[PDB]
Structure formats: C-alpha cells, structure tokens
Design a protein around this ligand. Structure first.
Ligand SMILES: [Mg+2]
Ligand SMILES: [Mg+2]
Ligand SMILES: [Mg+2]
Ligand SMILES: [Mg+2]
Ligand SMILES: [Mg+2]
Ligand SMILES: [Mg+2]
Lengths: 175, 112, 72, 58, 51
RNA sequence: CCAGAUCUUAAAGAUCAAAAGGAGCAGGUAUCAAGCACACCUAUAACGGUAGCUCAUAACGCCUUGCUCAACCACACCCC
C-alpha cells in the first residue's frame, strides 16, 4: 500500500519552473489538498512505475500494464471496503484480478526474469490454476476428511508394528 | 551392446505438468491422431513420468525424453535428456540469443 | 397458433400444483423417509472405508455428521 | 509416418524453424524464414527422406 | 554430407538474416528520431499551458 | 520384448511362445463425478524421507456381450 504525501504539487504542475518562489497560497491551490481522488491516482501510478519498472516511457509493455492494473485493483479494494453492498464495482474488482492474473501468466511464459521481479515487488502471489474446478459440497469434504484421517491411522498401525513386533523378534536374538 | 527397451516410444517431446514428487517430473506428451470419420488430425494427450536427477524441471517447460533401458517402477519408464525450452528463458537455437516471444532480448547484430 | 401448446402446459402445471397441495403431508413423510435412507447409506459407505483399511474401530475423534439434516 | 511424433509450437521463437530428433540422439535443425510451402517439402525430402530406389525395391 | 550441407544452408540463411536486420535496425532508428521530434514538439506545447 | 518347453546339429539356427510392456484402435450408460492409498526418493531390498497418484479427452462404478476370422481369447461339474 502507498500513501502520497498531502502537500505535493499534482502531476501536471511539477516540471514547470518557478514554483518554489510562489507564495503558499497558490501552492495550496495546486497541492493534493484541493485535488480529488483522480489526481491522487496519477501520483500513485507515477511513483509506482518509477520504483519497479525499468523503462517508464514504454506503455505498451506487459509489465507497465500490470502496474497500471494494480493501481486500479488497489483503488477498487479501498472502494469496496467502504461500500460493501455495491455489486457493479465488485464485478469490476473480480474481472480486474482475472485480467492481471491472465497477463501475469503471459509474462511468465515469455520473460521469466522480469516476471520474478514484478511478482516480488508488488507482493502478488501467483498460484497455478488448479485442474478440475469442482464445487466442494458437504458430502465430498466430509468423506475426504475421513480418508485422510484413516490414512494417518494406518501409518501409526504399521509404524508401531515396525517398532514393537521387530523388537519382539529381536528380543529372542538379543536374549 | 544390448541396451534396448520394450516400449514403443524411444524419444518423445512433451510439456512439463508438475514437479510435485521427488526427483521426478510429470510431463504431457502430445501426438496427432487421425479421426477415421472426419479424416482430420486432433491432439491426443498422454502423461509420462521422467526421472530428473538434478531437479531442473520448472512447470511450463518443453522437455525431450529418452527411453529408460530398465524401468525403475511400474510408471517411471523414461529419463529426462535435455531442457529444450526453459520457461521464460528461451534462447533461439538459430542465432543463440535470448528472446522473449517475438522480440529479441539482445540484438544479434551487435557483437560489441 | 402456438397458444395451443402454452395452454396444454398451463393445465398440466395447474393440476400438478393441486396434486401437491392435496397430498402435501404425504410428500413430507416420504421426503423425510428418503433423507433417513440417504443418511444411513452414507454411514455404511464411510463404515466400509475403515473396515477395508484394516482398522477395527473408526479413527478417534471422528463422529460422522448428519449432513442431510435441516439446519441454518 | 504414423509412428513419428509431430508437435506444434506457436509464437515462442521469432524465426520459424523445424527440429528433427534422430534415434542416436542426433538433432537436425532446419531454418525456414523465407522458403515457400513447396521449398520446405523438397528440402525435408532430401535431408531425411527416403530415396526413390529404396521405396520401389521395398 | 547431407548434414554438412544442411549446416552450410543454415549459415547461408544466417548471413542474409544479419544483413536484413541491419536494414530494419537502421529504419528503426529513423522511426525513433521522427517519434522523438513529435514527442518533443508536444512536450513543449503542453508545458506552455501549464505555465 | 520374450523367459521357458521342444525339434535339428558342427551349439547356434528354427517352430510354439508364458510373464511383462504400449504409438494407436476398442460395446451401451455421467440420473456412475469424484475413486480413497490408488504415488515417488534414498539406500536398503530394511529403515528413513517427501505428500503425492488416476479423472469431464470420462477415473472409479453399473448393464449387455465371445471375436477385428488361414485364425485368435477363454472354460473343462460347482465354490474366479
Ligand atoms: Mg396434460
Ligand atoms: Mg508373449
Ligand atoms: Mg528364446
Ligand atoms: Mg535357443
Ligand atoms: Mg433415474
Ligand atoms: Mg473349475
């Protein structure tokens, strides 16, 4: 997560010369104080790419787009935490995650070195798509739990059989 | 010089599915099979087990497999030979230069 | 016109919705009866698992839940 | 060639090519970047194809 | 000998590829220069209004 | 791929081919959708270690049935 400082000139009114010589009044009118959420995203996107990307001037690169989507994904999550019953934005959040997931897979199969750096910097955790998407109903999860528990119990029966029964035979040898 | 095998496949090329087990990679071989009715070729997927001694398999690779002279179990009958295309790290066999899909990572016309 | 088919499907649904209402409690008895056999058959399936695995008793701490039971 | 495995790979190498794996571990690399449909078949038929005399005597 | 011929054939095509890439690379630099002037012209215009 | 049995003989040729294995092909049914130990490593041919394997391209089930024919597969009262 990132936190743009409040008293910073917005993206556009930065490179123009002669700003620091202006009085505090105009600097206040251009800072993030008098700018809406839209201007905040620009500063987040500008800073984020300058920290992880190699060539910021390239926008068509996959890594650049993944950074752009991550900014929107974080923005949607903040909106979702406030407006919980909103369904239009929840759909956007899920589709944005799926698009980033699809683009991360494409980046991995082309440039592994860049994919590793993007995955580490942004904190994204890439999980392989599990085969055979099935709905885990109560009957299946119950029976699966029993089979795993029975499997562990069989190991204990054999493990103690390996210890005690062999020792009993070895008792005759040792005497 | 008797080091033959009884399997019908001596050399095969397939994609790595997973590397969950110890020093063994499950690969998926693809072949073309003619449909008798439509007279068209479709892919048929089969899963093979290959023994990787160096643990060099990453999911998504294309691996050449060599038939094992003696099976090590009822399923492992093939041994990995080479990594044809490392995932994400693909070097063009012609120019011997790193590449990422269509765009060359390094220009082959720039020796220095 | 196609109304000769919607009307035929209208009458059948209207008569079925009266067969359920007239014998509502008969279906209640059968539904609960089938649910008990559904639960019992599930118990035998789990009982078969541990008996064939060599165990004598079910693993400790395992009480089979009643999945086909009314809850909320 | 019913017993020869043929596998396709799309958009992995900027330069199209064909690779042949022999029984003795030999690798044959065929480079195609401007050759037409007909040229490749004639090129393949000569590097690894069978001779006409061999087929007719078989 | 067929293997030897095929090896020479790849080398012959490789020389053509290296020559052709230089032509593409030279054109790419020309395209980059034209893009740079267009971007610089728009950069100057945009900064004037912000000032 | 083929041990083994047999025949011939200059002990290396041939006839039949168990077991085991797989490029592909192979009845109906998904209202049979999950099977429940079905994997692998080390050295041992133990122990120890990893937590995996098959499956919507049909696993696991159920029903019907000799066959792809110089012939092949199976049964020899019943409890495979
Ligand atoms: Mg009716
Ligand atoms: Mg046999
Ligand atoms: Mg023999
Ligand atoms: Mg003999
Ligand atoms: Mg039914
Ligand atoms: Mg009998």
């Amino acid at each position: 997560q990132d936190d743009p400082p409040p008293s910073m000139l917005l993206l556009d009114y930065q490179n123009v010369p002669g700003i620091h010589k202006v009085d505090d009044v105009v600097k206040r009118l251009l800072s993030l104080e008098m700018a809406n959420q839209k201007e905040k995203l620009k500063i987040k996107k500008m800073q984020l790419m300058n920290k992880v990307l190699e060539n910021p001037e390239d926008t068509s690169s996959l890594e650049a787009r993944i950074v752009a989507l991550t900014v929107k994904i974080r923005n949607y999550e903040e909106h979702m935490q406030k407006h919980r019953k909103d369904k239009a934005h929840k759909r956007f959040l899920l589709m944005s995650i799926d698009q980033r997931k699809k683009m991360l897979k494409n980046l991995r199969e082309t440039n592994y070195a860049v994919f590793e750096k993007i995955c580490k910097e942004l904190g994204i955790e890439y999980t392989f798509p599990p085969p055979y998407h099935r709905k885990a109903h109560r009957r299946w999860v119950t029976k699966k739990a029993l089979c795993t528990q029975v499997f562990r119990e069989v190991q204990k029966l054999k493990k103690q059989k390996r210890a005690l029964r062999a020792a009993a035979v070895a008792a005759h040898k040792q005497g | 010089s008797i080091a033959r095998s009884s399997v019908h496949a001596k050399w095969v090329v397939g994609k790595v599915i997973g590397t969950a087990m110890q020093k063994t990679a499950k690969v998926r071989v693809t072949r073309l099979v003619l449909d008798p009715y439509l007279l068209k070729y479709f892919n048929k997927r089969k899963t093979y087990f290959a023994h990787d001694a160096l643990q060099q398999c990453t999911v998504g690779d294309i691996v050449l497999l060599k038939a094992l002279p003696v099976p090590r179990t009822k399923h492992v009958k093939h041994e990995l030979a080479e990594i044809i295309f490392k995932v994400g790290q693909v070097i063009d066999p012609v120019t011997g230069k790193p590449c990422a899909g269509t765009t060359y990572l390094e220009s082959p016309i720039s020796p220095e | 016109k196609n109304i000769l088919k919607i009307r035929r499907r209208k009458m059948n649904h209207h008569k079925y919705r009266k067969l359920v209402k007239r014998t509502r409690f008969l279906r209640r008895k059968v539904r609960e009866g089938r649910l008990r056999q559904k639960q019992v058959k599930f118990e035998r399936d789990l009982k078969r698992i541990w008996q064939k695995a060599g165990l004598k008793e079910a693993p400790a701490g395992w009480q089979t839940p009643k999945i086909y039971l009314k809850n909320q | 060639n019913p017993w020869v495995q043929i596998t396709m790979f799309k958009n992995m190498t900027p330069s199209p090519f064909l690779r042949f794996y022999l029984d003795s571990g030999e690798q044959v690399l065929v480079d195609v970047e401007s050759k037409s449909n007909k040229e490749i078949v004639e090129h393949i038929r000569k590097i690894l194809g069978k001779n006409e005399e061999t087929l007719e005597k078989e | 000998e067929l293997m030897a011929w095929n090896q020479a054939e790849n080398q012959r095509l490789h020389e053509l590829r290296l020559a052709r890439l230089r032509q593409e690379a030279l054109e790419q630099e020309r395209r980059q220069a034209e893009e740079a002037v267009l971007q610089a012209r728009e950069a100057q215009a945009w900064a004037q209004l912000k000032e």
